[PDB]
Design an enzyme around this catalytic site. Structure first.
Site, short mmCIF file in Angstrom:
data_model
loop_
_atom_site.label_atom_id
_atom_site.label_comp_id
_atom_site.label_asym_id
_atom_site.label_seq_id
_atom_site.Cartn_x
_atom_site.Cartn_y
_atom_site.Cartn_z
N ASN A 153 -52.62 16.04 -3.06
CA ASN A 153 -53.69 15.77 -4.02
C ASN A 153 -53.30 14.79 -5.13
O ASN A 153 -54.03 13.83 -5.37
CB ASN A 153 -54.18 17.08 -4.63
CG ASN A 153 -55.43 16.89 -5.44
OD1 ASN A 153 -56.02 15.82 -5.41
ND2 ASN A 153 -55.85 17.92 -6.16
N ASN A 162 -61.65 13.34 -1.58
CA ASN A 162 -62.25 13.82 -0.35
C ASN A 162 -62.71 12.66 0.55
O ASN A 162 -62.57 12.73 1.77
CB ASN A 162 -63.43 14.76 -0.65
CG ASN A 162 -63.01 16.03 -1.36
OD1 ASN A 162 -62.03 16.70 -0.97
ND2 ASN A 162 -63.74 16.40 -2.40
N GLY A 188 -56.54 31.02 -2.55
CA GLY A 188 -56.61 32.40 -2.14
C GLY A 188 -57.20 32.44 -0.73
O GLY A 188 -56.57 32.92 0.20
N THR A 189 -58.41 31.92 -0.60
CA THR A 189 -59.09 31.88 0.68
C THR A 189 -58.46 30.83 1.57
O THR A 189 -58.54 30.92 2.79
CB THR A 189 -60.58 31.53 0.50
OG1 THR A 189 -61.22 32.56 -0.27
CG2 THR A 189 -61.27 31.43 1.83
N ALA A 196 -62.97 35.82 -4.19
CA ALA A 196 -62.00 34.86 -3.68
C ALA A 196 -60.56 35.29 -3.99
O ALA A 196 -59.78 35.61 -3.07
CB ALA A 196 -62.28 33.51 -4.28
N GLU A 227 -51.37 14.37 22.48
CA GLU A 227 -50.54 13.20 22.23
C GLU A 227 -49.76 13.34 20.94
O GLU A 227 -48.54 13.21 20.92
CB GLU A 227 -51.40 11.94 22.13
CG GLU A 227 -52.16 11.59 23.37
CD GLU A 227 -51.64 10.32 24.02
OE1 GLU A 227 -51.32 9.37 23.27
OE2 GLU A 227 -51.57 10.28 25.27
N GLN A 245 -64.82 21.38 0.60
CA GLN A 245 -65.26 20.20 -0.14
C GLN A 245 -64.80 18.98 0.65
O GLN A 245 -65.55 18.04 0.90
CB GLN A 245 -64.61 20.17 -1.53
CG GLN A 245 -64.67 21.50 -2.29
CD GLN A 245 -64.24 21.39 -3.75
OE1 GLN A 245 -64.87 20.69 -4.54
NE2 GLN A 245 -63.16 22.07 -4.11
N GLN A 250 -62.57 26.88 -0.62
CA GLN A 250 -63.50 25.96 -1.27
C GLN A 250 -63.07 24.55 -0.99
O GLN A 250 -63.83 23.76 -0.44
CB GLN A 250 -63.53 26.15 -2.78
CG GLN A 250 -64.30 25.05 -3.47
CD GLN A 250 -64.39 25.23 -4.96
OE1 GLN A 250 -63.39 25.07 -5.67
NE2 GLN A 250 -65.57 25.56 -5.45
N1 LIG Z 1 -58.25 16.76 -2.22
C1 LIG Z 1 -58.83 17.83 -2.71
N2 LIG Z 1 -58.10 18.82 -3.22
C2 LIG Z 1 -58.86 19.86 -3.69
C3 LIG Z 1 -60.25 19.97 -3.70
N3 LIG Z 1 -60.66 21.15 -4.26
C4 LIG Z 1 -59.54 21.75 -4.59
N4 LIG Z 1 -58.42 21.03 -4.27
C5 LIG Z 1 -57.02 21.42 -4.52
O1 LIG Z 1 -56.76 22.63 -3.80
C6 LIG Z 1 -56.23 23.63 -4.70
C7 LIG Z 1 -57.32 24.54 -5.18
O2 LIG Z 1 -57.59 25.67 -4.37
P1 LIG Z 1 -58.79 26.61 -4.98
O3 LIG Z 1 -60.05 25.85 -5.10
O4 LIG Z 1 -58.27 27.21 -6.24
O5 LIG Z 1 -58.90 27.74 -3.96
P2 LIG Z 1 -59.39 27.86 -2.51
O6 LIG Z 1 -58.17 27.43 -1.70
O7 LIG Z 1 -60.66 27.20 -2.27
O8 LIG Z 1 -59.52 29.49 -2.25
P3 LIG Z 1 -59.60 30.63 -3.40
O9 LIG Z 1 -58.33 30.72 -4.25
O10 LIG Z 1 -59.75 32.08 -2.86
O11 LIG Z 1 -60.81 30.24 -4.25
C8 LIG Z 1 -55.69 22.87 -5.89
O12 LIG Z 1 -54.36 22.48 -5.63
C9 LIG Z 1 -56.65 21.70 -5.98
O13 LIG Z 1 -56.00 20.59 -6.61
C10 LIG Z 1 -61.00 18.92 -3.17
O14 LIG Z 1 -62.22 18.86 -3.09
N5 LIG Z 1 -60.20 17.86 -2.68
#
Ligand SMILES: Nc1nc2c(ncn2[C@@H]2O[C@H](COP(=O)(O)OP(=O)(O)OP(=O)(O)O)[C@@H](O)[C@H]2O)c(=O)[nH]1
Ligand SMILES: Nc1nc2c(ncn2[C@@H]2O[C@H](COP(=O)(O)OP(=O)(O)OP(=O)(O)O)[C@@H](O)[C@H]2O)c(=O)[nH]1
Ligand SMILES: Nc1nc2c(ncn2[C@@H]2O[C@H](COP(=O)(O)OP(=O)(O)OP(O)(O)=S)[C@@H](O)[C@H]2O)c(=O)[nH]1
Ligand SMILES: Nc1nc2c(ncn2[C@@H]2O[C@H](COP(=O)(O)OP(=O)(O)OP(O)(O)=S)[C@@H](O)[C@H]2O)c(=O)[nH]1
Lengths: 426, 429, 117, 426, 429
Positions: B196, B218, B134-135, B89, B244, B14, B10
């Site tokens: 993050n 993002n 997870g994903t 997921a 490079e 994003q 996800q």
């Molecule tokens: N910069 C940024 N960090 C994000 C964003 N969405 C999630 N994160 C970070 O990435 C991690 C979240 O991962 P999840 O959304 O739980 O999972 P996923 O990696 O999409 O995959 P699944 O666990 O299977 O759903 C956390 O550490 C969040 O703080 C985003 O849009 N931008």
């Protein structure tokens, strides 16, 4: 994805009416009507609880198990009562005697096959099954006995899909029955060994939380039920919504159960303010964690403050900062380092949906796995012995084809279950 | 050249939608695909009107990829390129890598083999994942895995968003990140890292806003990234190919992870203030409060930095602003490294969102680098792991998902030699 | 006062009690009666009592002793079990008076009666 | 930032209604309404006394402590009575007996925890806490006893934030109660050792100052209260306004207390002229110092002219010359070198706000720390002994679980307190 | 170059807003920052169309800095440069220096290191504080403290408003001023002094008004100060750099404190009267009723004066008007000093507030100097201290704030040798 609710017994049933009363509105499904949904998001994931037949008739995919007609005939003759396909009603016009043994070995054992039949018709519905929701009370026949059987069978048929159990453990102060610890000890036994997520609610932990946290002076059952159903909606259905950080039964399970017993939790809702006045809106967020993490407000009887936690899952559902959420959780974890167990660096499992409870701005379901619930099975287990010792109303069990070693079994089992749970409080 | 991109998880999606936004935004290609080679290394001129993306999207819940096919940009990608597994997921590596994630991979690959063919002599795949998911952790693990074998002859720069130092989300996070590191380590070319949390600071301290939506972080990486591919693969006074990087950026085979940093982060509303000097931004680069990573140069000696500049910049200005730095000493560079400053100069200045909160200067510095600093960040993230593993915590969640006491314990030992590695390659002379 | 009563009670029972509220548990009240009557099922009384349910048992035991003896004095368990200061203060004051008049010459071993709990 | 008012007892409560009656208007806050403020400055600093919930409902952040329902049920059933969030009302329907012992050890001690609870809900409100305002009378139960407890607890919870105390020390000539010196001596004791700023007002020092300095012929209580509340507004709230030279509770504290006792002051308002006629406007400034520094006009009973000063704080609030202010203060310090103590080169603490009392052009609150107040605790202390000696109405205390050494304690303590204060008059 | 400025304490901020006002007023830069090098030694050309200040503002209560960001000028500074500590001011040194004041300092410094960098070869920081305050005495104490070490290689001229001789305000004042003197003494270059009371006299006797708002005294120093930096750092027929001062103004390392004096103080409404002669104003400078300091040359032998003139002035007029003075003898200059007259000539005449109460002449004399006179002022202020310390008076207020019997007693001894110093360097031959 999906799940298939299970309304075992009267209570578990009565609550069904409230769990579905809610959930539906939280999904715009009128009695037999369809999706009037104020939005368009309360539909892309409904499947989890319904089925497509007509095109306006998404029918709840639950089971109504009970050996007392009058009950289901009160739930089916009232409000939303006419949305369940009749096929769902697995009644047992027999004598729904208040005996765990009468609904688990003699009377219920018959009605079982005619249930499993449907629990399969619903499971083999479509897509992919996740698990089954189970409501009931551990203080009666159709509840603890027959419902505790329904699962022992379910967990043999799909040891893959999960099993959340919503049990109304026998309230302390005053029990709504006499053999209670008999019907209870016997059902908890079955629980600790089949379902893998149990949410124990106490009719009197509710009253309290409903008469002092809601100046509500006449808390009818409908209410209690209503409050409960409010939590089970935040849990499941909720997470089947989008979110910055969403989880789902498993996450909840795979983050909350350190050790296979299955362990039981204690649900807590967030905005729990009295109607008019109180509508303080102090819900920025520190206000929700303020709530959720206090003693009172834990649908359980026991008080967290009386024993560490192993895991916690604040399943919030309302637009908030992954910062003011992820942050708060921390201080909380440090102000109370005392009780929060240490061998788990981050006990808390922050979860975050987006859309909130229909009419509210911000909420957060709490699912705590605290060692405090030790002091409840203790209770139950005590009541047993004090009466088992004299075989009190035992003839109503044995005389129903039971065993003097059966009761021994359960108590011990569930009694040991108390033991273990302490192994972490220390 | 080109460089495909696989946004996994996800988050990676994003961030993807974001980085993907900034793109068209500075290339005059409305969300409808149409604009009225150069940048062909990221966009294929399909049909005779549009510019279909040059990447793919992989999430096991539909929710997040779904939203892309609702909001303008809906028109941008091909209905095909956005892979989903309606299934589950699961915030657990195992399930995403092994058990479930497996089923999709083939299909996934197929696109990065179908999209990898259509092009003309590519350079690699910019992968976008979120370490602790997870994903994002699991899946990719085997995606990058299956790539290192199918195209060992290319670049594998994975752009990660590794675990907030104290503000993590998932309860297990480390399990998922000690596992995505060990499995990808022996497969990536250069792994970019953007923390993050340490980005929030930038939103609090260097832009002022306690209202930072994910949609912002993002926009930020969405910026630093634009400085990597976008503009670089774009002509300039000192071009820098993807290769490079890894060459001028990794001293050793460990898929080494540099850190991303941007110079001009100043909030709109400040937008009018007299702009900053070539010297100031340069200097801002050596401040541990502006680096999209909670790896404050607490001791970590840089060992190679790729100063990518863009906008109006005089090579002497640089070949001076950097000279001044090379002699600040308090910025101590590794020993075995005389000069470790890859000066990348582009022309076109940055391109800020029409009305987000990014200043909008006429020159910026997206400097990334390998710093003995992460010796920390990895440490602090490894320790986490142990604590839980030490009690098996959520272990039953993976085992029951086709993993073993092996993969954990044996991926722990893995990183162990990543704590020694990032220690040996520095701190010593 | 609270100070005086507590001092008296602690010496008599060989207890630690910091505050009057502690009496809410009902153990001490039972033991005071035991010193006088020596009829109380001490083993049954939850001396240490952490939880309210335990308090109730102590109260029941106390109630039974009153009934057995024919002691007219009222005992409002609901008030006392709360461990509120005023209610307990009042009850303790009465108990002391009761003890003063009733207690016989015979020596009483509080520790032994408790089983050293 | 901030502060949290505390309405202990009836009096302290009755006054609450007047302190808030005023203050609000001095902040444009209608009953439940919001900020109608004639200006825009009466808002940038309100926080000090309110909280943001709705957006038009800035609720006073005070506490209403009392063991007599009727009272708070008169304050809550009248004018501004419907602005306090009900949560604020910490009542004790018990018998609010007029015994210091009945509201400090037996009856009040229970209601305390349910108070501290809120005093924390309000403290942990937001931003940074400064201190708490405390109103009450040292001649009753809910006032001296229970309110004197509320602080002993407050001062254990935040020995950092300040504690201003507004006490209605037992007027001389006639005592509006009988045990008065009992309830008093016992509360002053608690004061000299917890709060660090006390402003002692005398119902008869007021009458006088209200029947001769305001030709007012029928000075109802409402009035007295009103006059008092006028001073406590000049003190706090005021300084939380801009000024050429502004101060704040601490400055006031850190400039007025030479020695840790806590010391008690005697407030005096500036323009205190009868309505129509008198409206002389002779308020250039020498007229305000003329006022403030005279004997009569000191809300205290004692007369300054009867004992040196240690500190003085003319907290003016109305546009004036830092010259005609800083200057006047001097001559004043020289015309009366006699009584003004010497070991302090500049006893006076000139303070200067900007905006004045809503409808007035220029005012100046006076907070004097004179050694004269020795001749009051003397009084009180006397009354005690004369009656203690015979244990007069002592059975109402002891019989409530008290000690014969408790009374001894207080008197002595507060009695010594008289001693010390003389150590400077010389 | 330039010369930064740090206005500390409500007062130093009120005076700041004032001195800062007079500025733009005589530089054609409306409150909007825009005017339609020279003066660059006090204003940075942020781009761009604006003229962002070249100073900072430090108060622990918001009240006073708040008012700046309300009233036109609101547009003048950068939202950033006005530092505040929502916390508590406290009219006590200790708390402001140690305990509280500490927390902010870092941040404070940061600006005087961030603003000190942006420039081009600066000369120092004109500090504005109010000796007897909490945020003004304490804080600065360590601000100037942390400066003397971070930029020992510059000028530290602190412009103070030391304690009114009889009309003080705070009850403790001396505690706060014997403490700001001892801690800053070993850190300042030249400390200018302007006595709040002795300025009132000027408002009563040389302008007539018993209605002097603080806003006036500020307009005044706001004037004398304009003669220091503003115009001086501004081209002229006899330029005088900041360094120049301390050099031509301090005979000894003690951060010596000269006194500020202005010549033409005459009230508008007088505005038409025939102007005063070059000789008269010159002479007015030797009158103990026109010197912004209650240190009447009761005996204090001057030891160096920096006669800064501005407007239409013929060097001979000066190199004559001064000659006449050098031979008045009743103006007795130190022995060891032959000639101690630094003649500073500027061009542009003064610039009076459009309609305040300042005459508005076409020439003025802002003469400042070190006079053995302060032997008094310090004395009279030291004595104060003792009286109270002698009884510990408000001592518990500092101790409980991270101070000790040391800092007081040991800062008393400090000034003691400042009473001997200002005595020895004079009165003897
Ligand atoms: N910069 C940024 N960090 C994000 C964003 N969405 C999630 N994160 C970070 O990435 C991690 C979240 O991962 P999840 O959304 O739980 O999972 P996923 O990696 O999409 O995959 P699944 O666990 O299977 O759903 C956390 O550490 C969040 O703080 C985003 O849009 N931008
Ligand atoms: N000339 C002049 N003197 C001022 C002004 N404001 C205050 N003062 C003088 O400076 C001293 C006051 O300092 P305060 O305002 O009490 O305190 P502060 O130095 O701002 O710092 P804090 O004590 O922490 O509030 C007194 O001697 C005043 O007479 C002003 O605007 N102009
Ligand atoms: N919260 C909640 N508790 C209920 C409800 N109905 C019953 N209970 C609780 O459940 C227990 C008994 O449940 P009940 O519904 O009688 O089980 P049953 O199996 O259907 O009973 P039977 O048919 O053998 S007599 C009691 O402890 C009672 O307090 C309900 O609608 N809500
Ligand atoms: N100024 C002022 N004094 C008051 C007021 N109400 C009472 N008093 C004074 O306070 C003292 C008694 O106060 P009171 O309000 O009776 O205390 P209480 O604790 O609420 O009384 P109780 O409930 O134990 S009987 C007397 O000296 C009386 O003169 C009031 O509204 N204003």
């Amino acid at each position: 994805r999906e799940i298939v609710h299970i309304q075992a017994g009267q209570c578990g049933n009565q609550i069904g009416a409230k769990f579905w009363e809610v959930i539906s509105d939280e999904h715009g499904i009128d009695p037999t009507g369809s999706y009037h949904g104020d939005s368009d998001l309360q539909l892309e994931r409904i499947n989890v609880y319904y089925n497509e037949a007509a095109g306006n008739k998404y029918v709840p995919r639950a089971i109504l198990v009970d050996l007392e007609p009058g009950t289901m005939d009160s739930v089916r003759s009232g409000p939303f009562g006419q949305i369940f396909r009749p096929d769902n009603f697995v009644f047992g016009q027999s004598g729904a005697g208040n005996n765990w043994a009468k609904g688990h070995y003699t009377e219920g054992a018959e009605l079982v096959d005619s249930v499993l039949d449907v629990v399969r018709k619903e499971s083999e519905s479509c897509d992919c099954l996740q698990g089954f929701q189970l409501t009931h009370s551990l203080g009666g026949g159709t509840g603890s006995g027959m419902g505790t059987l329904l699962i022992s069978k379910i967990r043999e048929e799909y040891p893959d899909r999960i099993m959340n159990t919503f049990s109304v453990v026998p309230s302390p102060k005053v029990s709504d029955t006499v053999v209670e610890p008999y019907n209870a000890t016997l059902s908890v036994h079955q629980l600790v060994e089949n379902t893998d997520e149990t949410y124990c609610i106490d009719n009197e932990a509710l009253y309290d939380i409903c008469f002092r946290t809601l100046k509500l002076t006449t808390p009818t059952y409908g209410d209690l039920n209503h409050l409960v159903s409010a939590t089970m909606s935040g849990v499941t259905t909720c997470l089947r919504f989008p979110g910055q950080l969403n989880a789902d039964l498993r996450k909840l399970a795979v983050n909350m159960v350190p050790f296979p017993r299955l362990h039981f939790f204690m649900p807590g809702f967030a905005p729990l303010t009295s109607r008019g006045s109180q509508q303080y809106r102090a819900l920025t967020v520190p206000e929700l964690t303020q709530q959720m993490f206090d003693a009172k407000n834990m649908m359980a009887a026991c008080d967290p403050r009386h024993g560490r936690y192993l895991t916690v899952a604040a399943v919030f559902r309302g637009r908030m900062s992954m910062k003011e959420v992820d942050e708060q959780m921390l201080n909380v974890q440090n102000k109370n380092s005392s009780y929060f167990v240490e061998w788990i660096p981050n006990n808390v499992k922050t979860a975050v949906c987006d859309i909130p409870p229909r009419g509210l701005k911000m909420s957060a379901t709490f699912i705590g796995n605290s060692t405090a619930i030790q002091e409840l099975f203790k209770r139950i287990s005590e009541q047993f012995t004090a009466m088992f010792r004299r075989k009190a109303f035992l003839h109503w069990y044995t005389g129903e084809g039971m065993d003097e070693m059966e009761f021994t079994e359960a108590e011990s089992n569930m009694n040991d279950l108390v033991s273990e749970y302490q192994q972490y409080q220390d | 050249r080109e460089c495909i991109s696989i946004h996994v998880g996800q988050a990676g999606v994003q961030i993807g939608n974001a980085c993907w936004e900034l793109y068209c935004l500075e290339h005059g290609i409305q969300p409808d695909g149409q604009m009225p080679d150069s940048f062909n290394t990221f966009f294929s001129e399909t049909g005779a009107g549009k510019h279909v993306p040059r990447a793919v999207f992989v999430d096991l819940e539909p929710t997040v990829i779904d939203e892309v096919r609702t909001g303008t940009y809906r028109q941008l990608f091909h209905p095909e390129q956005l892979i989903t597994g309606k299934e589950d997921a699961a915030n657990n590596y195992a399930r995403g890598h092994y058990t479930i994630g497996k089923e999709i991979i083939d299909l996934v690959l197929d696109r990065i083999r179908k999209l990898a063919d259509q092009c003309t002599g590519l350079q690699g795949f910019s992968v976008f994942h979120s370490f602790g998911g997870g994903t994002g952790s699991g899946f990719t693990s085997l995606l990058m895995e299956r790539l290192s074998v199918d195209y060992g002859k290319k670049s594998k720069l994975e752009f990660s968003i590794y675990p907030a130092p104290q503000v993590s989300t998932a309860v297990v996070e480390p399990y998922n990140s000690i596992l995505t590191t060990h499995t990808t380590l022996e497969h990536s070319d250069c792994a970019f890292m953007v923390d993050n949390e340490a980005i929030y600071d930038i939103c609090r301290r260097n832009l002022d806003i306690e209202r930072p939506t994910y949609t912002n972080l993002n926009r930020l990486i969405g910026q630093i990234v634009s400085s990597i591919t976008a503009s670089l693969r774009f002509d300039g006074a000192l071009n820098v190919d993807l290769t490079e990087f890894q060459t001028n950026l990794v001293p050793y085979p460990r898929g080494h992870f540099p850190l991303a940093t941007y110079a001009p982060v100043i909030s709109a509303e400040k937008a009018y203030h007299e702009q900053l000097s070539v010297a100031e931004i340069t200097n801002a680069c050596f401040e541990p409060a502006n680096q999209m990573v909670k790896c404050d140069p607490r001791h970590g000696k840089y060992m190679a930095c790729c100063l990518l500049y863009r906008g109006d910049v005089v090579p002497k200005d640089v070949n001076a602003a950097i000279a001044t730095i090379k002699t600040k000493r308090t910025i101590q560079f590794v020993d075995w490294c005389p000069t470790g400053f890859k000066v990348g100069i582009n022309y076109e200045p940055p391109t800020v969102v029409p009305g987000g909160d990014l200043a909008k200067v006429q020159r910026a510095v997206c400097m990334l680098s390998n710093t003995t600093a992460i010796a920390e960040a990895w440490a602090r993230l490894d320790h986490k792991f142990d604590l839980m593993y030490a009690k098996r915590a959520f272990v039953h969640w993976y085992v029951g998902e086709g993993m073993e006491e092996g993969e954990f314990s044996e991926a722990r030992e893995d990183m162990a030699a990543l704590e020694k590695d990032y220690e040996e390659v520095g701190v010593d002379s | 006062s609270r100070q005086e009563l507590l001092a008296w009670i602690n010496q008599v029972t060989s207890l630690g009690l910091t505050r009057i509220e502690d009496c809410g548990k009902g153990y001490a009240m039972i033991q005071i009666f035991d010193s006088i009557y020596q009829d109380i099922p001490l083993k049954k009384v939850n001396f240490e009592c952490n939880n309210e349910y335990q308090y109730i048992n102590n109260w029941k035991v106390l109630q039974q002793v009153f009934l057995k003896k024919g002691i007219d004095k009222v005992v409002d368990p609901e008030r006392l079990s709360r461990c509120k200061m005023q209610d307990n203060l009042e009850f303790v004051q009465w108990a002391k008076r009761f003890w003063d008049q009733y207690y016989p010459g015979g020596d009483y071993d509080a520790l032994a009666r408790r089983g050293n709990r």
